[PDB]
Amino acid sequence: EAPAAVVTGAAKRIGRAIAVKLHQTGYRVVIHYHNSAEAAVSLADELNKERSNTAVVCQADLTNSNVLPASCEEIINSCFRAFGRCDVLVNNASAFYPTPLVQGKTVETQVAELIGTNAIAPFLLTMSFAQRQSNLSIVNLCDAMVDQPCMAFSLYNMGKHALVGLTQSAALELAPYGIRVNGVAPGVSLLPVAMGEEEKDKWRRKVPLGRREASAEQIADAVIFLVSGSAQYITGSIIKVDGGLSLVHA
Amino acid sequence: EAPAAVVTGAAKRIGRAIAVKLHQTGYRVVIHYHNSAEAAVSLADELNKERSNTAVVCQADLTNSNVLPASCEEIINSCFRAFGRCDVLVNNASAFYPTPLVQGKTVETQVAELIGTNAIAPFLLTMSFAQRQKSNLSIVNLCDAMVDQPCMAFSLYNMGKHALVGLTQSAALELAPYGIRVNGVAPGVSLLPVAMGEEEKDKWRRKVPLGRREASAEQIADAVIFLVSGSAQYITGSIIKVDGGLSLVHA
Amino acid sequence: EAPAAVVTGAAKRIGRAIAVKLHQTGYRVVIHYHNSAEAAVSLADELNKERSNTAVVCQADLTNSNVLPASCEEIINSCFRAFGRCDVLVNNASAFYPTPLVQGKTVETQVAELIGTNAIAPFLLTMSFAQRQSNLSIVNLCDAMVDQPCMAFSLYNMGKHALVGLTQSAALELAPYGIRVNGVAPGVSLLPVAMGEEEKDKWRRKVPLGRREASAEQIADAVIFLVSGSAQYITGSIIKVDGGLSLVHA
Amino acid sequence: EAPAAVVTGAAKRIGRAIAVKLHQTGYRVVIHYHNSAEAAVSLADELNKERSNTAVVCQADLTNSNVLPASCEEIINSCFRAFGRCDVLVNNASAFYPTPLVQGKTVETQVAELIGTNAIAPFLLTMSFAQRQNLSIVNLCDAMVDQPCMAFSLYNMGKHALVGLTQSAALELAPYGIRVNGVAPGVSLLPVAMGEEEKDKWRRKVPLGRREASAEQIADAVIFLVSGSAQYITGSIIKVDGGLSLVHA
Numbered sequence A, C: 001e002a003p004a005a006v007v008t009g010a011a012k013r014i015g016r017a018i019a020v021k022l023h024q025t026g027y028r029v030v031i032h033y034h035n036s037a038e039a040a041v042s043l044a045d046e047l048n049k050e051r052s053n054t055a056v057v058c059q060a061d062l063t064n065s066n067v068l069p070a071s072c073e074e075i076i077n078s079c080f081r082a083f084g085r086c087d088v089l090v091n092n093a094s095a096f097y098p099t100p101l102v103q104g105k106t107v108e109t110q111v112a113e114l115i116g117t118n119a120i121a122p123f124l125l126t127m128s129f130a131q132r133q134s135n136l137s138i139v140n141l142c143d144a145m146v147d148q149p150c151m152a153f154s155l156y157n158m159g160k161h162a163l164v165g166l167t168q169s170a171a172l173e174l175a176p177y178g179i180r181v182n183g184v185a186p187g188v189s190l191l192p193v194a195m196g197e198e199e200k201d202k203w204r205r206k207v208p209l210g211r212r213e214a215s216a217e218q219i220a221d222a223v224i225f226l227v228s229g230s231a232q233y234i235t236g237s238i239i240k241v242d243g244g245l246s247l248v249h250a
Numbered sequence B: 001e002a003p004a005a006v007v008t009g010a011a012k013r014i015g016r017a018i019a020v021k022l023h024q025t026g027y028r029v030v031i032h033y034h035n036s037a038e039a040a041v042s043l044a045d046e047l048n049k050e051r052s053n054t055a056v057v058c059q060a061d062l063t064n065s066n067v068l069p070a071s072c073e074e075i076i077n078s079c080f081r082a083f084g085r086c087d088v089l090v091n092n093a094s095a096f097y098p099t100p101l102v103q104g105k106t107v108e109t110q111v112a113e114l115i116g117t118n119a120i121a122p123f124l125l126t127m128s129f130a131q132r133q134k135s136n137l138s139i140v141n142l143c144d145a146m147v148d149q150p151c152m153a154f155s156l157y158n159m160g161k162h163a164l165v166g167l168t169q170s171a172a173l174e175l176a177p178y179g180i181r182v183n184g185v186a187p188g189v190s191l192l193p194v195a196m197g198e199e200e201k202d203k204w205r206r207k208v209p210l211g212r213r214e215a216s217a218e219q220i221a222d223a224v225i226f227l228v229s230g231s232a233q234y235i236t237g238s239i240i241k242v243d244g245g246l247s248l249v250h251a
Numbered sequence D: 001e002a003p004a005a006v007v008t009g010a011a012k013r014i015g016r017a018i019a020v021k022l023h024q025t026g027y028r029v030v031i032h033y034h035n036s037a038e039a040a041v042s043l044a045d046e047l048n049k050e051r052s053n054t055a056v057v058c059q060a061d062l063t064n065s066n067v068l069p070a071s072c073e074e075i076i077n078s079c080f081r082a083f084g085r086c087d088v089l090v091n092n093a094s095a096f097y098p099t100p101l102v103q104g105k106t107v108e109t110q111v112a113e114l115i116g117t118n119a120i121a122p123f124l125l126t127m128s129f130a131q132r133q134n135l136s137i138v139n140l141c142d143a144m145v146d147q148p149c150m151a152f153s154l155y156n157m158g159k160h161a162l163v164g165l166t167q168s169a170a171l172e173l174a175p176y177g178i179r180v181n182g183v184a185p186g187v188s189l190l191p192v193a194m195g196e197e198e199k200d201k202w203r204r205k206v207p208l209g210r211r212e213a214s215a216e217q218i219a220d221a222v223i224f225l226v227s228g229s230a231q232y233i234t235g236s237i238i239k240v241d242g243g244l245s246l247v248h249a
């Protein structure tokens, strides 16, 4: 039997790269999406052309709310329904935008989105993944710049720190069940679609190794290592994939 | 004129000790509390008997909800209402209980409480504190020295304390241009839980390299007083461990 | 043209397992050793039987002294002399013994040995590696327990801390030359030969992931990853390979 | 009776400020120096003028060598000879200069100087301090240790080893009641020769006030750690950096 993976936010960019690589490695994949239905299905179409019935899609909002646990549980269930098993969870989906401390979503909607997508949904999915249970692991997409954060990104930063705490707490607690829990921390990978090109080059120029961003594939490579048999003793570890960026003083 | 401080969860234990020491240092204090009304009033009474009109209490639930921001705004506004200023914010109030990943409150209530008290309310109180300014302004967040060696089955609590580390850093960076410093104090083992039995308390005490005992509430409060003082005017974004070496001890 | 790697302290245990996996991956190897002459030459024989002329030994004391730079330069030179190139350096050789602060070598010898092997030698080998110069990289064998250190191991812990600093500084400074510098940090792996059984078992019981020590091969797997094409954007990272041990409170 | 402190590299700048504040707090002080004899002596004369018989000087090279353990024992012993006790050790003296990985001092002299001053000497002074016993040690660290100066490998290795010492010694000496902590400046007093335009570059990076820490601000954090108000604090390194270490590239 082929193992199975859930990748959240898998329609585009890094999540897509991660789904594609797991599938190339032999996984069957659940492609979760929120708004990008068309892109999710076109990826599944591409993956299912390669190997029939090895990719499904799954829709969910991962904003925190009264129904988030049920949604998270259904994401995990959808993998069991499609493939009869769930070997790997990749927590990739993530809201990202500024939340200034001093001055139209309300602040509490921003808390729900930023803290839900980056921390609470990962926790709930982690609970469901472990409950519903080999080489089992979870990989959380973290952020190499958590200790030198973007200015005015308090909530996003809080959510990523919380995700580090989850990675550690879950590694500790799930080790007796054979479930490893690790992270991959990009620095500058694919820049935001909205960022202007000048500003993109400014960030690229900061990176010591090659003065460029990481491709989505290079991030996906670290995920693939972490879920592999070459990482069977690794839990609680967060691998930076940042080209030295986090080492560069102001 | 005397400066003023808000201390969250200040009715008892470490919060009380911080309020008392701020008061002994010359601050007027807002003693925030949630359920411990009697202890909070008893504190304010003692402080006002020492110096009249220098302590008031302020009730608020710091669970996350759509009204938590107005509740946090009101906490800061109660300092200005009582004392005409707000110089210091200490984020001490904290929910703390296990949330096992594999198996009472709904999980969304646990999230609301553990993440709300430990991170969201500090963030909203920071926003409000900063917004109301309009000097030695600072914020001290009560953190946790065992954050990278966490208590088994305390996921949400640990997430909340990690998030608070991130707020401390993010706010230190962002509020520095306003002259608001933001720091943290990280206890290891201090006052053990009221409900813990003596035998269990001793097991923890025996782990502590420095004196095989927990930190007094006062010793925690001392590090808070340092960070608010003029002796710490260049310190921002620092979290001081107050743990007798506990976090250095391997399994 | 097959790449070439120097592995220090490669006669035995983790260093051995690293040299073996590097060789299996296609590398030619310099098997550095200090006192383990017989195991070193025996390992070279093993590997050379598999592919002729793909392993040589190189003897050197890595204690700090006025001649250590020359010795380090020679180790690198020995890789060029055997194979015409040097693509990978693995800093594995390491002295390890207690140096109590309060009361049969002298303290300056203990300093030279512990700080030399764990920090100075890696620094000088890094200099000579870079000076002599693609997928070039350096992997430093660190320690996951560096912030929860063994009692009365000050000098050793100082050495491994210094080694983290080197990893970071070297990643930063060598990134313009295309040389990546990373680390692998074991917790409990192969236990001391001189340690007694009951004590070995006490340490095993502490490891959340499986209640056992890492094999030398599990440690080598992480080295192999960091030198590979799948780690091309990775520099300045230290991967814990510790089964969750560093997450466990006292 | 008055407690006593050894401050290494105390003739100038941050070490001087530390020695003065310790003295203002009631400590008798050993002012260690290497080359700056004239400044160490004028400091001693200043402090003895304030209160008689409360400052002495001690010359020593803290470069690593065969004789460094004896030199470090002598510094401690000199505190006992002058004052009958040694309550506080402040490891401040520090060599600092670039050591590029790719290219008069040989590289082994740089190793001896950079690693000796920043790490080995603190280690030897710590053993001597402890062997002779509110006792504490404060080590001067560096807030920028994880975002290091380009081409300062050996220096950075030295300061990292110092963090390790701080932690290892905190753990091991806790049973004797000796606390061991650090103060980590980011940008404090800039090099004497540095052009203002270069100094200002650094000052502008500092979120809190867009200026460097005074030596006195660094000293304040030392005074807190040695005090009765830090009685439970061991193995802690306090950044005194105006938020510099939180600033991304």
Ligand SMILES: NC(=O)c1ccc[n+]([C@@H]2O[C@H](COP(=O)([O-])OP(=O)(O)OC[C@H]3O[C@@H](n4cnc5c(N)ncnc54)[C@H](OP(=O)(O)O)[C@@H]3O)[C@@H](O)[C@H]2O)c1
Residues within 6 Å of the ligand: A008, A009, A010, A011, A012, A013, A014, A015, A032, A033, A034, A035, A036, A037, A060, A061, A062, A063, A091, A092, A093, A094, A095, A096, A113, A117, A141, A142, A143, A144, A185, A186, A187, A188, A189, A190, A191
């Ligand atoms: N890009 C970088 O340079 C970088 C740097 C540091 C860290 N990271 C981390 O690496 C991961 C991938 O980054 P990325 O740049 O590829 O991410 P991204 O494009 O910002 O977002 C990934 C996906 O997250 C999903 N998402 C957003 N809000 C959601 C919600 N409320 N509910 C459910 N799904 C939601 C979206 O799915 P739909 O499109 O289907 O709505 C989106 O496509 C993230 O965790 C990120 O924080 C990335």
Ligand SMILES: NC(=O)c1ccc[n+]([C@@H]2O[C@H](COP(=O)([O-])OP(=O)(O)OC[C@H]3O[C@@H](n4cnc5c(N)ncnc54)[C@H](OP(=O)(O)O)[C@@H]3O)[C@@H](O)[C@H]2O)c1
Residues within 6 Å of the ligand: B008, B009, B010, B011, B012, B013, B014, B015, B032, B033, B034, B035, B036, B037, B060, B061, B062, B063, B091, B092, B093, B094, B095, B096, B113, B117, B142, B143, B144, B145, B186, B187, B188, B189, B190, B191, B192
């Ligand atoms: N004690 C330790 O050894 C230790 C260890 C590590 C970290 N710390 C940190 O140091 C701080 C103080 O510790 P502690 O042991 O003194 O704390 P605590 O006794 O557990 O709780 C402090 C106060 O938190 C308030 N609180 C709890 N839930 C709340 C809610 N939903 N809304 C508003 N307030 C709420 C309570 O106020 P009421 O009583 O009025 O309801 C309580 O009195 C905490 O942040 C803690 O995490 C302590």
Ligand SMILES: NC(=O)c1ccc[n+]([C@@H]2O[C@H](COP(=O)([O-])OP(=O)(O)OC[C@H]3O[C@@H](n4cnc5c(N)ncnc54)[C@H](OP(=O)(O)O)[C@@H]3O)[C@@H](O)[C@H]2O)c1
Residues within 6 Å of the ligand: C008, C009, C010, C011, C012, C013, C014, C015, C032, C033, C034, C035, C036, C037, C060, C061, C062, C063, C091, C092, C093, C094, C095, C096, C113, C117, C141, C142, C143, C144, C185, C186, C187, C188, C189, C190, C191
């Ligand atoms: N084993 C673990 O659990 C563990 C835990 C954490 C970190 N690590 C790190 O992983 C690496 C490998 O660990 P290990 O247990 O396999 O190492 P080890 O057996 O203790 O030492 C490996 C080799 O280092 C060489 N060595 C010692 N002193 C030397 C000197 N003065 N000059 C040159 N070489 C010298 C020895 O070579 P000869 O035998 O040829 O004399 C020895 O065989 C080390 O860096 C270690 O610190 C290991």
Ligand SMILES: NC(=O)c1ccc[n+]([C@@H]2O[C@H](COP(=O)([O-])OP(=O)(O)OC[C@H]3O[C@@H](n4cnc5c(N)ncnc54)[C@H](OP(=O)(O)O)[C@@H]3O)[C@@H](O)[C@H]2O)c1
Residues within 6 Å of the ligand: D008, D009, D010, D011, D012, D013, D014, D015, D032, D033, D034, D035, D036, D037, D060, D061, D062, D063, D091, D092, D093, D094, D095, D096, D113, D117, D140, D141, D142, D143, D184, D185, D186, D187, D188, D189, D190
């Ligand atoms: N200035 C900063 O911004 C900054 C930033 C980060 C960390 N720090 C740390 O804070 C501490 C004080 O900094 P600073 O700028 O005031 O230091 P500094 O002026 O660079 O050096 C202080 C003293 O160290 C002594 N020293 C140098 N080499 C020595 C040797 N071989 N043996 C004995 N003593 C030696 C010198 O004593 P003599 O003059 O008597 O020869 C010198 O005056 C240092 O530990 C430093 O690394 C400072």
Ligand SMILES: Cc1ccc(-c2c[nH]c3nc(N)nc(N)c23)cc1
Residues within 6 Å of the ligand: A093, A094, A095, A096, A143, A187, A188, A189, A190, A191, A192, A203
């Ligand atoms: C220059 C730049 C811009 C964004 C990001 C990024 C970090 N975390 C992120 N998380 C998400 N969900 N999207 C992102 N685009 C980022 C990193 C560097």
Ligand SMILES: Cc1ccc(-c2c[nH]c3nc(N)nc(N)c23)cc1
Residues within 6 Å of the ligand: B093, B094, B095, B096, B144, B188, B189, B190, B191, B192, B193, B204
């Ligand atoms: C042995 C022991 C027991 C509890 C605590 C504790 C950590 N964080 C905490 N946070 C709160 N709000 N209360 C607590 N009691 C703790 C630490 C060590």
Ligand SMILES: Cc1ccc(-c2c[nH]c3nc(N)nc(N)c23)cc1
Residues within 6 Å of the ligand: C093, C094, C095, C096, C143, C187, C188, C189, C190, C191, C192, C203
């Ligand atoms: C129970 C135990 C005993 C030793 C080691 C070990 C740490 N670092 C080490 N470094 C070297 N060069 N050899 C080792 N054997 C170790 C780890 C756990």
Ligand SMILES: Cc1ccc(-c2c[nH]c3nc(N)nc(N)c23)cc1
Residues within 6 Å of the ligand: D093, D094, D095, D096, D142, D186, D187, D188, D189, D190, D191, D202
């Ligand atoms: C712009 C600048 C220049 C030097 C220093 C400094 C760091 N560590 C140091 N250590 C010593 N012994 N001296 C120093 N002068 C420094 C910090 C910022």
